[PDB]
Design a protein around this ligand. Structure first.
Ligand SMILES: C/C=C(/C)C(=O)O[C@H]1C(C)C2[C@H]([C@@H]1OC(=O)CCCCCCC)[C@@](C)(OC(C)=O)C[C@H](OC(=O)CCCc1ccc(O)c(CCCCCCNC(=O)OC(C)(C)C)c1)[C@@]1(O)[C@H]2OC(=O)[C@@]1(C)O
Ligand SMILES: [K+]
Ligand SMILES: [Mg+2]
Length: 994
């Protein structure tokens, strides 16, 4: 395996010591394979149902629950025969929760798809090699190809390994590197080595990357590297080495787990400490077993009271909902947990072309020199109407319409555009529109031609179909395209050698038409065509040319410029070696400049404002383009990244400038920069790590497989709907319309989602707090079980689940986007808020406990044990002659529990209205504000009633319907909550800062 692109064909045949005609010898193959391994990507990690299930049972809370599920299972295995049969329902349900919860997690992961797996979609199953053991070619399994052996590839074939090309068996070799480099059009490959050893893939012209397809031709080559060592394998590793943090809310959930675990434990110790006097009781097992059973069944209750068993159910459903809500807006969220992290984006890095602009090129300014008379000079600027690739528009000089033909200079310019260009136009009748056939910038020159047909060649009486390439093909027939010197990033330009065809044109026969970067080509021009004549390119004329070139790329126009020239006396045909990108630059010299063409890549409509939104939203936007920084910066000003007069010294760098900086300044640059032009692949990944060293949540756009590494490391990777599948499977979200503004819209829903989501979480949590309080008093005072596990779960999954999810539909704040990005480390409940719930729980804990006790003593239905130990109720059948002239079974009664459970239920509907706003009073933000809320509160109540009356139910919950007067008591107990909160809110509102 090597750096073959820089090495020569021999040197490579040398390195491996393999014969180009024999290939590797069967021995060499065994040796080579055992030294370089199979040519395939690392096997998938092996996870089994077992591990997968065990993982479900790793969470701390899930364990705490599983444990209680047993104390319960055993306790229920100790009931009194017929006194109870429903005994086994408490433990059975907890399991269903855990069983359910597991089943989810597993189905969740089975349906998951690995971004690293997608890559394997780019590995051919078979390949063709030439080995010593046979004369003819052999079609083996890609996996068995080895670095060194000879391989031949042809059209259709997907490249197997990273190959250095030895000799092209065809006239030309075209490859589709789209995925790995991002060049839609098939490029041309050669055999000559590339000097630079640190070259980027795009410039390795003698290289075949594994996974890319061969568009046209057939060639032979020696395998540079295989497996994880190939260009794609290097990506697989960056991705496999990339580790992703958990959603801040996912973190908070682990945080809350550890903590709850502590508290519960302390509660136990406290509870034990309270009932310490028991160490001063007569020594004899007077319910030694009846007392332990008691605590254990309080333990299990205490557990289901502290854990919000329906919260993950609610969050998952709120996320799924908003998700669809976004889909309608072209934002396809792949992972639900992300809708949150999205909301916290502080930096968005977007590619320019496909997303910030339309990528729908069009030329709207031309200019040909009009006169050179020493120092005096005058150009001929023009403007061209139309943004579409449609052959409709006109040409104007000072806004005044013109027939292009009248200018000789334009007749030349025009041809160059049709001849040099490989692209073309087509018109699909189904959609009734003109379509770009080749590349955006060339296919533009195509429509430019059409719109200015120099010869007036009448075409009006044509259909749109044929109208598409009319004026080009006109010029296509005039000259004969002999051969083309393709584009090369060194000389930044391409050309075409042309013959006159039919005689009478013989004189000035062979010509050479060039088009490339202005500074580039113009420095190679010794002449300038003024009409049909020519004149020595002089300094004055050159300054004037390069001056206009800058107003066009730097001015409010933000135009990309193409210099069009011509070599009048082109080197003799045979004196040219048409297969070495290196010499083409030398063949494209001694040129006479004819004129430049300025085209535009219009920014999308909804982009300007989207950029403004981010300003208000405190989100930094960083552009990633291919433009030079001169125009890059212009485009950045045009859309809003920069002000029109804003300084940009240390806020816009280039791929080189950046690299030329020491790791320190490099880092410093990233916290201020915004426009990054001509950026290599490695970069996207460095810029992310730096933005991270500043604790920022960044977003990164990408389309191809080369972006996957970066996308997988950005907090939120955004893939293009039009982009590769690997890219998509690597990102958290996808943009159907590839439109940057879709990103922003997405971020806003994230802030909206987390806001509502925020509340129902605070809501379900407080209720769990109050539930615990109840249990704590129940045991701290030795009272009869006020609330039972079975009941609690109902209230936690259903009675509170409905109000909870509804709170997810709270009307969004109007200023959501006028506030900076949320801090991930922001706790959900602290300070003053902590206290309110500290007080609310403290309340319901009292309301629930007391509600039940009040039935025992003080009620007309219940036996007033009033101000006498209801508490020592356990020692009762024995001690009855003392303080018990009644039946020791009242305590098992349903009325009492059915009391607390009702006060709990009504207090949780009341606390659901208090959760409509953290600090706004209901008198201000009335409950009717959120209809869904009220509706569910009805569904909930009726559900409560259902389990009270419909016969089968009451029995299992240990609940007996209570009459019209007991109910009124529930109200006199619950309702005060609303007031307690209004007060506590009023405090926040008016004294404590805020
Ligand atoms: C909870 C109950 C109790 C008793 C408790 O003691 O709770 C503790 C506790 C741990 C807290 C404290 C509270 O302290 C007390 O109540 C003291 C009073 C004790 C009185 C004793 C005598 C009566 C909270 C609560 O107190 C107050 C006033 O809200 C405040 C905070 O809660 C938060 O922010 C929440 C937002 C973060 C947060 C965000 C997302 C979440 O999903 C969660 C909780 C849900 C985790 C998953 C559970 C659901 N299901 C599940 O796991 O598995 C299933 C699906 C069931 C299978 C929390 C936390 O401070 C939290 O610990 C944290 O790390 C914080 C800083 O989050
Ligand atoms: K990621
Ligand atoms: Mg790209």
């Amino acid at each position: 395996m090597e750096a073959a692109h820089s090495k020569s064909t021999e040197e490579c045949l040398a390195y491996f010591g393999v014969s180009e005609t024999t290939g590797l010898t069967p021995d060499q193959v065994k040796r080579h394979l055992e030294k370089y391994g199979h040519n395939e990507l690392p096997a998938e990690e092996g996870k089994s149902l077992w591990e997968l299930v065990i993982e479900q049972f790793e969470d701390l809370l899930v364990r705490i629950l599983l444990l209680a599920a047993c104390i319960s299972f055993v306790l229920a295995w100790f009931e009194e025969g017929e006194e109870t049969i429903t005994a086994f329902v408490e433990p059975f349900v907890i399991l269903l929760i855990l069983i359910a919860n597991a089943i989810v997690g597993v189905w969740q992961e089975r349906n998951a798809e690995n971004a690293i797996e997608a890559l394997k979609e780019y590995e051919p199953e078979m390949g063709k090699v030439y080995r010593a053991d046979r004369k003819s070619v052999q079609r083996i399994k890609a996996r068995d190809i080895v670095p060194g052996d000879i391989v031949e590839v042809a059209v259709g074939d997907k490249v197997p390994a990273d190959i250095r090309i030895l000799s092209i068996k065809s006239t030309t070799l075209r490859v589709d590197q789209s995925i790995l480099t991002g060049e839609s059009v098939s490029v041309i490959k050669h055999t000559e080595p590339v000097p630079d050893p640190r070259a980027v893939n795009q410039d390795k012209k003698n290289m075949l990357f594994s996974g890319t397809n061969i568009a046209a031709g057939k060639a032979l080559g020696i395998v540079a590297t295989t497996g994880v060592s190939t260009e794609i394998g290097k990506i697989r590793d960056q991705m496999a080495a990339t580790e992703q943090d958990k959603t801040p809310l996912q973190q908070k959930l682990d945080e809350f787990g550890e903590q709850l675990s502590k508290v519960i434990s302390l509660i136990c110790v406290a509870v034990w400490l309270i009932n310490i006097g028991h160490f001063n009781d007569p020594v004899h097992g007077g319910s030694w077993i009846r007392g332990a059973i008691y605590y254990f069944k309080i333990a299990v209750a205490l557990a289901v009271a502290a854990i919000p068993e329906g919260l993950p159910a609610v969050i998952t459903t709120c996320l799924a909902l908003g998700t669809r809500r976004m889909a309608k807006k072209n934002a396809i969220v792949r992972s639900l947990p992300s809708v949150e992290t999205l909301g916290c984006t502080s930096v968005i890095c977007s590619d320019k072309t496909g997303t910030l602009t339309t990528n729908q090129m069009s030329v709207c300014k031309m200019f040909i020199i009009d006169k050179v008379d020493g120092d005096f000079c005058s150009l001929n600027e023009f403007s061209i109407t139309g943004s579409t690739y449609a052959p409709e528009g006109e040409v104007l000089k000072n806004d005044k319409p013109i027939r292009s033909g009248q200018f000789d200079g334009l007749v030349e310019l025009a041809t160059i555009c049709a001849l040099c260009n490989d692209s073309s136009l087509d018109f699909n009748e189904t959609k009734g529109v003109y379509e770009k056939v080749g590349e955006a910038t060339e296919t533009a020159l195509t429509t430019l031609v059409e719109k200015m047909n120099v010869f007036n060649t009448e075409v009006r009486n044509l259909s749109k179909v044929e109208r598409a390439n009319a004026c080009n093909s006109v010029i296509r027939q005039l000259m004969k395209k002999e051969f083309t010197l393709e584009f090369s990033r060194d000389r930044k330009s391409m050309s075409v050698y042309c013959s006159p065809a039919k005689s009478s044109r013989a004189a000035v026969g062979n010509k050479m038409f060039v088009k490339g970067a202005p500074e580039g080509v113009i420095d190679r021009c010794n002449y300038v065509r003024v009409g049909t004549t020519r004149v020595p390119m002089t300094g004055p004329v050159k300054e004037k040319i390069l001056s206009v070139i800058k107003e066009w790329g730097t001015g409010r126009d933000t135009l990309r410029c193409l210099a069009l020239a011509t070599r009048d006396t082109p080197p003799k045909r045979e004196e040219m070696v048409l297969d070495d990108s290196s010499r083409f630059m030398e063949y494209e010299t001694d040129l006479t400049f004819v004129g430049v063409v300025g085209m535009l890549d219009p920014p999308r409509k909804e982009v300007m404002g989207s950029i403004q939104l981010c300003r208000d939203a405190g989100i930094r936007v960083i552009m990633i383009t291919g433009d030079n920084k001169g125009t890059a910066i212009a485009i950045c000003r045009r859309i809003g990244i920069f002000g029109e007069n804003e300084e940009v010294a240390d806020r816009a760098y280039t791929g080189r400038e950046f690299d030329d900086l020491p790791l320190a300044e490099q880092r410093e640059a990233c916290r201020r920069a915004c426009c990054f032009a001509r950026v290599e692949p490695s970069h996207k990944s460095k810029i992310v790590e730096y933005l991270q060293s500043y604790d920022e949540i960044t977003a990164m756009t990408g389309d191809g497989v080369n972006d996957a590494p970066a996308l997988k490391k950005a907090e939120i990777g955004i893939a293009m709907g039009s982009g590769t599948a690997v890219a998509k499977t690597a990102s958290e979200m996808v943009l159907a319309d590839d439109n940057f503004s879709t990103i922003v819209a997405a971020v806003e829903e994230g802030r909206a989602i987390y806001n509502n989501m925020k509340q129902f979480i605070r809501y379900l949590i407080s209720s769990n707090v109050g539930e615990v309080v109840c249990i704590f008093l129940t045991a701290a005072l030795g009272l009869p079980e006020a609330l039972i596990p079975v009941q609690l779960l109902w209230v936690n999954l259903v009675t509170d689940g409905l109000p909870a999810t509804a709170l997810g539909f709270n009307p969004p704040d109007l200023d959501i986007m006028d506030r900076p990005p949320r801090s991930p480390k922001e706790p959900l409940i602290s300070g003053w808020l902590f206290f309110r719930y500290m007080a609310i729980g403290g309340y319901v804990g009292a309301a629930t406990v007391g509600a039940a006790a009040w039935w025992f003593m003080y009620a007309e239905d219940g036996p007033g044990v009033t101000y006498h130990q209801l508490t020592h109720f356990m020692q009762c059948t024995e001690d009855h002659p003392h303080f018990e002239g009644l039946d020791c079974e009242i305590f098992e009664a349903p009325e009492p529990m059915t009391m607390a459970l009702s006060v709990l239920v009504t207090i949780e509907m009341c606390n659901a209205l208090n959760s409509l706003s953290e600090n706004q009073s209901l008198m201000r933000m009335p409950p009717w504000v959120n209809i869904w809320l009220l509706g569910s509160i009805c569904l909930s109540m009726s559900l409560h009633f259902l389990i009270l009356y419909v016969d089968p139910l009451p029995m299992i919950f240990k609940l007996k319907a209570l009459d019209l007067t007991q109910w009124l008591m529930v109200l006199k107990i619950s309702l005060p909550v609303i007031g307690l909160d209004e007060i506590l809110k009023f405090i926040a509102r008016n004294y404590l800062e805020g």
